[PDB]
Design a protein around this nucleic acid. Structure first.
Ligand code: MG
Ligand code: MG
Ligand code: MG
Ligand code: MG
Ligand code: MG
Ligand code: MG
Ligand code: MG
Ligand code: MG
Ligand code: MG
Ligand code: MG
Ligand code: MG
Ligand code: MG
Ligand code: MG
Ligand code: MG
Ligand code: MG
Ligand code: MG
Ligand code: MG
Ligand code: MG
Ligand code: MG
Ligand code: MG
Ligand code: MG
Ligand code: MG
Ligand code: MG
Ligand code: MG
Ligand code: MG
Ligand code: MG
Ligand code: MG
Ligand code: MG
Ligand code: MG
Ligand code: MG
Ligand code: MG
Ligand code: MG
Ligand code: MG
Ligand code: MG
Ligand code: MG
Ligand code: MG
Ligand code: MG
Ligand code: MG
Ligand code: MG
Ligand code: MG
Ligand code: MG
Ligand code: MG
Ligand code: MG
Ligand code: MG
Ligand code: MG
Ligand code: MG
Ligand code: MG
Ligand code: MG
Ligand code: MG
Ligand code: MG
Ligand code: MG
Ligand code: MG
Ligand code: MG
Ligand code: MG
Ligand code: MG
Ligand code: MG
Ligand code: MG
Ligand code: MG
Ligand code: MG
Ligand code: MG
Ligand code: MG
Ligand code: MG
Ligand code: MG
Ligand code: MG
Ligand code: MG
Ligand code: MG
Ligand code: MG
Ligand code: MG
Ligand code: MG
Ligand code: MG
Ligand code: MG
Ligand code: MG
Ligand code: MG
Ligand code: MG
Ligand code: MG
Ligand code: MG
Ligand code: MG
Ligand code: MG
Ligand code: MG
Ligand code: MG
Ligand code: MG
Ligand code: MG
Ligand code: MG
Ligand code: MG
Ligand code: MG
Ligand code: MG
Ligand code: MG
Ligand code: MG
Ligand code: MG
Ligand code: MG
Ligand code: MG
Ligand code: MG
Ligand code: MG
Ligand code: MG
Ligand code: MG
Ligand code: MG
Ligand code: MG
Ligand code: MG
Lengths: 181, 98, 44, 30, 76, 136
RNA sequence: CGGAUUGGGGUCUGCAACCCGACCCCAUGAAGCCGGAAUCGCUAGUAAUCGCGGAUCAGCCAUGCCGCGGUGAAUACGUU
RNA sequence: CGCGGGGUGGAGCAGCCUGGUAGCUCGUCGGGCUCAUAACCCGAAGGUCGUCGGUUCAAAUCCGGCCCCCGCAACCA
RNA sequence: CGCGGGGUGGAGCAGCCUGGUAGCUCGUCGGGCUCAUAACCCGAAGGUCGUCGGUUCAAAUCCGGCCCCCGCAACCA
RNA sequence: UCCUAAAAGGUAACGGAGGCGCCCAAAGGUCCCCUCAGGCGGGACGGAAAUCCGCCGGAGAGCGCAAGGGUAGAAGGGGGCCUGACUGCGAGGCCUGCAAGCCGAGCAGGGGCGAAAGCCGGGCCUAGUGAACCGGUGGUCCCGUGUGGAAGGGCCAUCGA
RNA sequence: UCCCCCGUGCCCAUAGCGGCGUGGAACCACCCGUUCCCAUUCCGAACACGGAAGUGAAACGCGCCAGCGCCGAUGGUACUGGGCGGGCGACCGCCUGGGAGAGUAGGUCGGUGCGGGGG
């Protein structure tokens, strides 16, 4: 399924602009969007392995990929978790399923968000990446209201060859990222 | 990574370093404890056609002809951080078949 | 617990050590007798 | 399959998701 | 008080030295961890015991990163 | 301090590393004989020094005790001593620089270091400064 | 259901409603699913429940007081 | 290790023998009543009957094995 | 000082053995009955588990030192 | 286990300081794969510390349990298959007064894992234990009181400090 | 002979990090794609396969620069088999042979073996 908007958006729009705002030499130097990850701090899905699959399967739809599992390792004595049996929910998508996800992001999810104001332009890893936070997971399209037994939250990320948050900012902006200015 | 390498380095003689490129497959018979290659049958850096797997076979046989010649037979194989599955497979395969 | 492994349709034993309560109840691990060679050995 | 976002404000994108009949609203068109 | 305790001497260390004749199976060096690595015709066991697998002379070879290997040069 | 309970005796060999140079201040106090210097001795010389020239400058005490002084309470030989009675001491061998003053007058120094010397069990000397450091 | 609280706008009395008036409109919708031990009022047009007026007084923080009518019960064996 | 007795509601016991009946005491909650606790009176939730298994129409029941407690005499190179 | 036992809400005392969740009585506080107080009834609050370091995912609980308390011992010369 | 112990080994005191009287059928065997703790920067609950992302980060983690030594060029982390926690053995050698302890190439039978080379006779290793006698339970080419047989015993296995 | 590059081993930091430069026809990597072998507890990122186009950006090769790291004299010195003397003691000294560590001058951003391809 190699065909979408955000695809050629980076190609015939962002790419050239990245040659403008900064300018380069080699094609393999211009910041390429390549890695996107998700995560869900599931200390909640400890007691309930049932509620665990629910979050995973829900995720499966909104991501268009295959959910994964990543428990803890240390030992939160304060909050009931130890060995690392409980759970954490992770899922990394790339190539096409990546582009298809971001499309839904800035055209579906972000749009109908509780008093949406944009993306905080500070959430850069000091280098050339970005990390955002979300609550209600139902802001995604396919997620029906009468199906969510909990407004489980989650946070994602996106890696790019970008080395500076200025290049990153420009990139993301050109990609179509409404940054709360 | 190269654990396996060290394993057979204490095994015996006549290692078979099977280094393969993204389109090539070099095969060298290097004996340790000295650092000398005997039967070095290259691939795309030799003569053969253009079919990685099949080439791996023909180069494996290339080793055979030169190996049996010098009287070498100890098939001490050297995986060289590669999974015995595809190209590297036909190497020792075709070479040990003939 | 001190475990002893018998043989199938014969009368040979083996030295073993099971776990009292720990997830271990029966021992169906194969072994090797002196009469013939290699037959499964039940706990017993 | 081509997810036809039927958002209620005049935008129908052909993304890729489950059930092309994805009824949404308040997207990027409004 | 309560301190007078100690496990008797285990008597480890270098058993054979470089420039020594050795049969086959002579415990070259009994070591704690792996202060001395095997090598040419030398293997170890559970307690990391070093012994000869052939017949010759014992030889040492320090190799920094790699380690302090010890071998035996067979001859007759 | 903070490490663990007791420690050995250990002889006091040559006055080697037990001996340095005037690193800070202007004047200095050096030992001539080797011995353990007691905590009570440090303070004794300390108070004596600072008390002499009221509102004194800065008094540097280079040495520092950390050797658990052992001792038994008038009995026999049931294990090792409780020690700690006198407290602790420092490995003080000839050449060492116990004290050294600064930002004050020479007369204040000479007299002070002198008095603080009597607070010490070891026969001592008083070195100026010179220029003996390590340079070019 | 409930109308507390609170934002903003506006009305009128009076020199003047920040402290302190009443009121209206929009939004806000608090605790409360019938009340712990304990305790109160009434024997018939009574209790319960509903509205009305007046003195007071510029106005009003009145759910207060005094008066009036509408509807309209229950039970009282007995005096330990 | 050998012998025999039982496990029954938050807890103990009768039911067991010779199967057709989960009942009893107290606690506990609500109701009656009292000056008050209580006595006393009404109603109610909680037991695969330690377990697995077998025979029977039905098994707490009779029986085999398994887990545990308690009792018994004996034993210890 | 040798050996043993013990520092837990304001008073006394359980929990430590068998690491996760401080219990009881009195008192204190607020409310009721009484003219009033106690008695009695209704509800509430109250601890750093002596101390310092260590063990542990985690310490009132486990280990070690110090400090305080109680008990026993302290002989032959 | 370490120090004392004086650079081979050994080495004492009512010398300093701390453990063991176990545990694991997966914490084993083979095969294939994988790399720490922390620090910073970024991120919904969390926020010193769950989980995810980037850069740094050679061993200060991990290695069941005290410590020492060793160790990511794996002894550590995970998955597949499996039961070598095999029998009959044992050149040689550590240690050592005796007894006891300890390593083990390779051979044979037979079996696991891998394509194979090859590895596997338990656990990274150094504590987790007990001569002999007495008797118990299973097994067996043996003995069996004139003779067949039984009692009883020996032998291999294993039990009660 | 010699040079550039590929495989692999040795010496085991004077080869490491880092900033700069530089090479793609060849060699190498990335790269295209995921139908077949095969795979990520999620992803062809990793492992794998078929193979053209593109770049030398990443990685690596080569070269430079010393700030960090590392190597390290010499000189003298501490200590010391051995022989001898002095002090109540704590300790001190000489003859004989041995001789560090630290600090100084200073060195280094590699050297090297066999085979393979290319001029
Ligand atoms: Mg499309
Ligand atoms: Mg380019
Ligand atoms: Mg899945
Ligand atoms: Mg929906
Ligand atoms: Mg936008
Ligand atoms: Mg001793
Ligand atoms: Mg002793
Ligand atoms: Mg001793
Ligand atoms: Mg002894
Ligand atoms: Mg301190
Ligand atoms: Mg000394
Ligand atoms: Mg004193
Ligand atoms: Mg004096
Ligand atoms: Mg004195
Ligand atoms: Mg003087
Ligand atoms: Mg309004
Ligand atoms: Mg009313
Ligand atoms: Mg009025
Ligand atoms: Mg009026
Ligand atoms: Mg009367
Ligand atoms: Mg009997
Ligand atoms: Mg009986
Ligand atoms: Mg009863
Ligand atoms: Mg009752
Ligand atoms: Mg039963
Ligand atoms: Mg049952
Ligand atoms: Mg008895
Ligand atoms: Mg007490
Ligand atoms: Mg008590
Ligand atoms: Mg106390
Ligand atoms: Mg208390
Ligand atoms: Mg008290
Ligand atoms: Mg108490
Ligand atoms: Mg009590
Ligand atoms: Mg205790
Ligand atoms: Mg608590
Ligand atoms: Mg309480
Ligand atoms: Mg009590
Ligand atoms: Mg009370
Ligand atoms: Mg009371
Ligand atoms: Mg009270
Ligand atoms: Mg009271
Ligand atoms: Mg009161
Ligand atoms: Mg009184
Ligand atoms: Mg309380
Ligand atoms: Mg305590
Ligand atoms: Mg607590
Ligand atoms: Mg007390
Ligand atoms: Mg006498
Ligand atoms: Mg030593
Ligand atoms: Mg020694
Ligand atoms: Mg001592
Ligand atoms: Mg065990
Ligand atoms: Mg395993
Ligand atoms: Mg394993
Ligand atoms: Mg991994
Ligand atoms: Mg960290
Ligand atoms: Mg921070
Ligand atoms: Mg952060
Ligand atoms: Mg963080
Ligand atoms: Mg939540
Ligand atoms: Mg965090
Ligand atoms: Mg943080
Ligand atoms: Mg932090
Ligand atoms: Mg292992
Ligand atoms: Mg493993
Ligand atoms: Mg495995
Ligand atoms: Mg099989
Ligand atoms: Mg042993
Ligand atoms: Mg064999
Ligand atoms: Mg093994
Ligand atoms: Mg082990
Ligand atoms: Mg062990
Ligand atoms: Mg037989
Ligand atoms: Mg027979
Ligand atoms: Mg006979
Ligand atoms: Mg017999
Ligand atoms: Mg037994
Ligand atoms: Mg460049
Ligand atoms: Mg260039
Ligand atoms: Mg595929
Ligand atoms: Mg095909
Ligand atoms: Mg298929
Ligand atoms: Mg796939
Ligand atoms: Mg790839
Ligand atoms: Mg194809
Ligand atoms: Mg090109
Ligand atoms: Mg190019
Ligand atoms: Mg480059
Ligand atoms: Mg090179
Ligand atoms: Mg130096
Ligand atoms: Mg030097
Ligand atoms: Mg210089
Ligand atoms: Mg320098
Ligand atoms: Mg360089
Ligand atoms: Mg060379
Ligand atoms: Mg040329
Ligand atoms: Mg030319």
């Amino acid at each position: 399924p190699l065909d979408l908007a955000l695809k050629r958006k980076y190609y015939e729009e962002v790419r050239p602009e990245l040659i403008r705002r900064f300018g380069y030499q080699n094609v393999w130097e211009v910041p390429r969007l390549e890695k996107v990850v998700i995560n869900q701090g599931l200390g909640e899905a400890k007691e309930d392995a049932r509620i665990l699959e629910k979050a995973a399967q829900e995720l499966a739809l909104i991501t268009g990929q295959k959910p994964a599992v990543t428990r803890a390792k240390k030992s939160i004595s304060n909050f009931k978790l130890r060995k690392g049996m409980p759970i954490g929910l992770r899922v990394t998508l790339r190539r096409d399923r990546m582009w298809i996800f971001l499309e839904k992001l800035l055209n579906v999810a972000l749009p109908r968000i509780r008093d949406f104001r944009g993306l905080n332009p500070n959430s850069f890893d000091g280098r050339g990446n970005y990390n955002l936070g979300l609550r209600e997971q139902l802001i995604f399209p396919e997620i029906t209201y009468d199906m969510v037994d909990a407004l489980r939250g989650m946070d994602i990320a996106v890696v790019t060859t970008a080395e500076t948050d200025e290049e990153a900012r420009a990139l993301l902006e050109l990609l179509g990222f409404p940054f709360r200015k | 990574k190269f654990r396996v390498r060290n394993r057979i380095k204490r095994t015996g003689r006549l290692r078979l370093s099977v280094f393969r490129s993204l389109k090539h497959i070099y095969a060298q018979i290097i004996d340790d404890e000295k650092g000398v290659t005997l039967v070095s049958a290259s691939s795309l850096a030799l003569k053969l056609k253009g079919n990685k797997t099949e080439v791996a076979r023909q180069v494996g046989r290339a080793l055979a002809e030169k190996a049996l010649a010098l009287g070498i037979k100890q098939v001490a194989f050297d995986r060289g951080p590669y999974k015995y599955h595809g190209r590297v497979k036909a190497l020792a395969e075709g070479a040990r078949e003939g | 617990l001190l475990l002893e492994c018998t043989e199938c349709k014969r009368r040979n034993y083996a030295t073993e050590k099971n776990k009292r309560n720990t997830p271990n109840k029966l021992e169906l691990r194969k072994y090797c007798p002196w009469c013939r060679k290699h037959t499964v050995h039940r706990e017993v | 399959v081509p997810a036809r976002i039927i958002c209620g404000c005049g935008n129908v994108i052909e993304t890729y998701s489950t059930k092309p009949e994805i009824y949404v609203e308040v997207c990027s068109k409004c | 008080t309560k301190n007078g305790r100690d496990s008797q001497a285990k008597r480890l260390g270098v058993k054979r030295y470089e420039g020594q004749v050795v049969r086959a199976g002579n415990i070259l060096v009994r070591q704690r961890g792996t202060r001395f690595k095997p090598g040419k015709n030398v293997g170890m066991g559970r307690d990391f015991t070093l012994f000869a697998l052939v017949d010759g002379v014992v030889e040492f070879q320090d190799r920094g990163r790699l380690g302090r290997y010890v071998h035996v040069r067979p001859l007759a | 301090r903070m490490k663990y309970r007791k420690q050995q005796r250990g002889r006091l060999k040559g006055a080697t590393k037990g001996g340095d140079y005037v690193a800070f201040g202007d004047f200095g106090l050096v030992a001539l004989e080797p011995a353990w210097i007691t905590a009570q001795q440090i303070e004794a010389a300390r108070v004596a020094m600072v008390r002499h020239f009221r509102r004194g400058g800065k008094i540097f005490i280079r040495i520092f005790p950390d050797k658990p002084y052992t001792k038994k309470p008038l009995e026999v030989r049931m294990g090792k001593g409780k020690g700690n009675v006198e407290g602790y001491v420092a490995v003080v061998k000839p050449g060492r620089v116990m004290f050294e003053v600064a930002g004050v007058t020479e007369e204040q120094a000479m007299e002070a270091l002198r008095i603080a010397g009597h607070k010490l069990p070891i026969k001592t000397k008083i070195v100026r400064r010179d220029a003996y450091d390590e340079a070019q």
